[PDB]
Amino acid sequence: NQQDFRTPEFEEFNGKPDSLFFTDGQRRIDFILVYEDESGTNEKQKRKRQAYESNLICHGLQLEATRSVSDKLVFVKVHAPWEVLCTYAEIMHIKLPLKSFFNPATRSRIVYFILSRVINRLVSSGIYKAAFPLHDCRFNYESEDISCPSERYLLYREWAHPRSIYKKQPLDLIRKYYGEKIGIYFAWLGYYTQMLLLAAVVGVACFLYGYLDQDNCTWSKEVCDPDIGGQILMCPQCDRLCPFWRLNITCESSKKLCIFDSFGTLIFAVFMGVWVTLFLEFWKRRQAELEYEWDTVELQTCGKCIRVTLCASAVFFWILLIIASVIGIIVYRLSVFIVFSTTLTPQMATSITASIISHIIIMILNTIYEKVAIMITNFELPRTQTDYENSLTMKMFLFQFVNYYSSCFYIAFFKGKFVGYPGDPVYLLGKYRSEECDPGGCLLELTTQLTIIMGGKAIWNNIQEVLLPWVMNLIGRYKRVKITPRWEQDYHLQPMGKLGLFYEYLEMIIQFGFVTLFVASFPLAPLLALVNNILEIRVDAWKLTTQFRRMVPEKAQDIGAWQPIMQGIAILAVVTNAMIIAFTSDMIPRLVYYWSFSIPPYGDHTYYTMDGYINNTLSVFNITDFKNENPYIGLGNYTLCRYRDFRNPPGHPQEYKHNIYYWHVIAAKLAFIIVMEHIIYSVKFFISYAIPDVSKITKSKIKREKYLT
Amino acid sequence: NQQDFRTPEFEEFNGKPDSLFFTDGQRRIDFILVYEDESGTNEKQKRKRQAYESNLICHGLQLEATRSVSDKLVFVKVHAPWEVLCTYAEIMHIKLPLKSFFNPATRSRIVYFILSRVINRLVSSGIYKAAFPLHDCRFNYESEDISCPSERYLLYREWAHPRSIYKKQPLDLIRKYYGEKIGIYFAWLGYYTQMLLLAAVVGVACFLYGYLDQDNCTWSKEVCDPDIGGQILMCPQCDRLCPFWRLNITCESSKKLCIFDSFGTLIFAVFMGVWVTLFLEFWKRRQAELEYEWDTVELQTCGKCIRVTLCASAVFFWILLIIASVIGIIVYRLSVFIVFSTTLTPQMATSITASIISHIIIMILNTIYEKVAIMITNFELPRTQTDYENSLTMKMFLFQFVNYYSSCFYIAFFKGKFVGYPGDPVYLLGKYRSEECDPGGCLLELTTQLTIIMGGKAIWNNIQEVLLPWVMNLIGRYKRVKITPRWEQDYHLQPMGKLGLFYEYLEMIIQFGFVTLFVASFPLAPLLALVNNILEIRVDAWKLTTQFRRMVPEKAQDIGAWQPIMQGIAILAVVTNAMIIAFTSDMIPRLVYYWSFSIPPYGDHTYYTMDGYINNTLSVFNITDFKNENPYIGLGNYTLCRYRDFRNPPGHPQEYKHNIYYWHVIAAKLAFIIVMEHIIYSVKFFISYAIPDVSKITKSKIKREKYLT
């Protein structure tokens, strides 16, 4: 309980480069503690470190220290004798196999438990420079020792190296080497990849059906027609800066719509609801199977309400701030301002530099959000580590959810919806002319945004994720910080800090939200997600195996707080897809025209048809602007312009007002929303109620194991 | 293992009327087995009974039999010695209080467990006439024995007698005497009564707000106006049998609407969604509290799929049959036919007799449904008793759900909705003129039906429930089947058969469905339910204590399969209330007229107002009927009649077609449905997520008990 003595066997030796044992070689190394003490504060640090070491030795752990070959750095090897391992395996209910005994992962876990009981506070408060377990050997080179298995080498060769991208991951080996948390994360990623493969095959089928039926979409042919669509003049989208544009300029865009706005996309949206339900249920079954196999199950007021309300209010305030930041696209404006202030076509180079600066600002904002969430959680800390982790997960996920989906939601649901008509357009404030929809359409803009986020941004994210730890290691290597032992080699690696796997989970949860919430836009989201995940498994494995210092293995029977998050995203996905199809997409007006507006009562066609849809939906507008300016007159000599709305034509008794067509279309949209939501929710409830939570084989295996034990 | 010997101490004695002990008096009676054997089948029955008795005695139970004072009836008293009780309390993990030992309830439970291990099959197959525990004494008279506590007498005096209706139930005493199932049922009933009191106070507040604001509802004043509402002629509701009726005849009805169709009802519907959420959550908390207090927690393929599909198809077929039976009101028609074939104003007597016959047919149909559900479950029996009970519960609940709510759903959502217009009315088949809405309105009809079901039918149900066991006992008493001992007295009581508490739960679940699903009609449903439950607690207690033979105590940590049923009813209630308000109620058209149809664009009023609503919603109709008959001409000389729809007036370019008003109203209804459903579901999710499942005090109490033990 006192600093009776220092670490015994204080001697230096690094002759063996791949030695995981002590100088004698009988007992292996289960932990390494790195500190520098040779050079008022220094004496206090020395005293505290000596006291901690003496207390640790008093518990039975064997510690011995060696100075670094390259001085003022001291590495203390920590090993647990057999009696200590047995007593703390009796204390901590570890399911050993009963018909070298403990694999190094569980040995390191036990030693870390011992360090925690009497380490994190010391490391944080400059007492210890580092504290970490040891890898077997270099990932690319076999271990010199023959007795010691180089399972890190095999893990790199068959699972982490890109040459083995097609091989299924050795999840048992991953769980054995890194622990249950990493293993369950990678198992979930693989299962997600398989389900994405299924959804991607179905989505490609629907996309191909839409693609083959391309020349037979009448409205696009009318749009591209120089007569039907070439003689339609559209009102300007802004004051004295947008010109009267004919519809022909959207012709190419219209073609893309016939591939992304068709009944195939609706069928695929229904199938995607079903697929999300199946994904959740079969993940529950697989999670139960993993719980059985890996034995992951183990056992170890007014003021509070006011604090909770205050923290929730602060979270809501910062969420609003992030909403304003993203919708206000202030990052791009700031990047442009910085580029202009600071100083092979110049346009593309300037765009690339602006994008790079925007990405840097984005990552800085992300770490700012992390800091804010940490501060808020500390402000309302319940001091329970699991509860603290869940609360921080929820806060950070909300921040990232807003930061990533605010632009998409604005494009889908709030961009161009409230614009009025060219006469008396809506002005929110002194700021004028709330932006209207793009000439191609809001659905096409949303599809383009999703393609950019899922196609290029995912690749750039993977490249940055694979290069950042490598660069951080390379700068240390060039910093000069000849043969090097194992502990020093692992010391010069980037330590995966707290909530390291949290970001890996968060990236995939954001991808899942992109795939499910906005699947009504384009059916190729599952395919892009599939490609990204196939790359992501290997990039995460490679960066964890090589570039990152080994973490203490943990245990977890589930992905954690992400399960309710995914369930909530699944619930929200039905509503979001229904809204996108009804509001963002133009399929409902086309269907209504085909079934109600082309018949004799409201048309001149004897049977249902789609021709004339373009000419019979664009409301006319004579140039009579309210003087509450009238920018149209100065632009050109045009007299009548047609806009995308269902107002009454000029000269009507109630002109520029919603007619029967508008309310019929609105009723159709709302009825579609209600029908789709109710049908999809009923199907999801039936599927969840008709699927066992645990696997059929797992029940029998558990029963047999209980019978035999 | 063989019939070595018969029951020892075979002797007769009934001198002590309230003796729960044997003839000696040292050991009490824990069970009574009643049989008759003194008079080829008889010898086999005798041999089997003797073998069973010998096997039972071999296990250590002490049995002795006495012949009835009034012959051929033999009662065998069964008692368990101390060693047997100890060994089977070690076998069955009973939480005894460790700082006469076993109360008679648990003694009877243990003895019944012993009987089952080596009784139900014997009783079913005529081997034993009966097998039951014993009450302490007569409910109205103190036990003669002083040592024996007459807790049945106290239970009747303070909880079951109607004189103690206002006193809170002694739930601990109920659990001690009857067991955990009965105790938890009564605790749930009491908690339901309290929550109903809260909801009823709020509903009475809303009803009073609607009642005070009665003279200021303009549309009812217009309806009752001899000028505005007296000059409106309505089209007949049927062919050549309904006359042209002026609106004045509905004036009184309109007044009632101003009390049941107002913003107060909407506010109360929102509050009722919130109240259902709070009810479920606080019941979860109370259930956890009871689990702690009473220690209720204890421990003891293609062909199958084809069988499941076949059984589900049969269930669906019978559900459709019950739908047709109830909507077809065949019970009332059959009762009228029977009355006419068989044979102080005659009208009221005939109506009362028809109602009595209808009630008899209803109870016969209920037992038929029970038999059908039993047969289906036996057809697909998984042979697990808990699973069998849950499946039978689901089947019987579905049958009763249909049988009780089909009429209400038809009135609310399918009666008068699809009628077309007087020109070319819709004919489903050769059967003509699908019935239109009542002149008062579908909402008033639904409110009247709910009042009849909740107000009078509940009282009649309570009267029948309290009289049926009493009559069945009285007929046995008059059958002559002088002093009588305890076992004979309890023998002459109606045995509460299998799933006896199932019906008690089912009645309250049906009442809960009536309260929640259709609360948008009238806000007084919680008050009527509160009165009915206040009576129901006492009637159930009285009929269980006095008129029914005592049941073996059981254990259950929850109400059972009824919890998911109530959760599903709660989920469906939001949708049903939204549909009722939007579709069944006329509030949405009134709101639209006040905000959109009374302004200058569609009205002549400078500001928002409700006057002129009646004259500006009833579509006109000139007498021009299709000849696909034209019954209107022969009825009278009227030329133009006004009907409740939004078709175009005659002479319009597209006359008798839905106009902009109809689609505006439909869009308003659907938007209200979407908004209300989403808001209510979000609020329910937030409330469930912000309420701990277990009580705050219960957590600390469990922690303290674990610390001290």
Ligand SMILES: [Ca+2]
């Ligand atoms: Ca990545």
Ligand SMILES: [Ca+2]
């Ligand atoms: Ca990653």
Ligand SMILES: [Ca+2]
């Ligand atoms: Ca399931």
Ligand SMILES: [Ca+2]
């Ligand atoms: Ca009753």
Ligand SMILES: [Ca+2]
């Ligand atoms: Ca009852």
Ligand SMILES: [Ca+2]
């Ligand atoms: Ca809760």
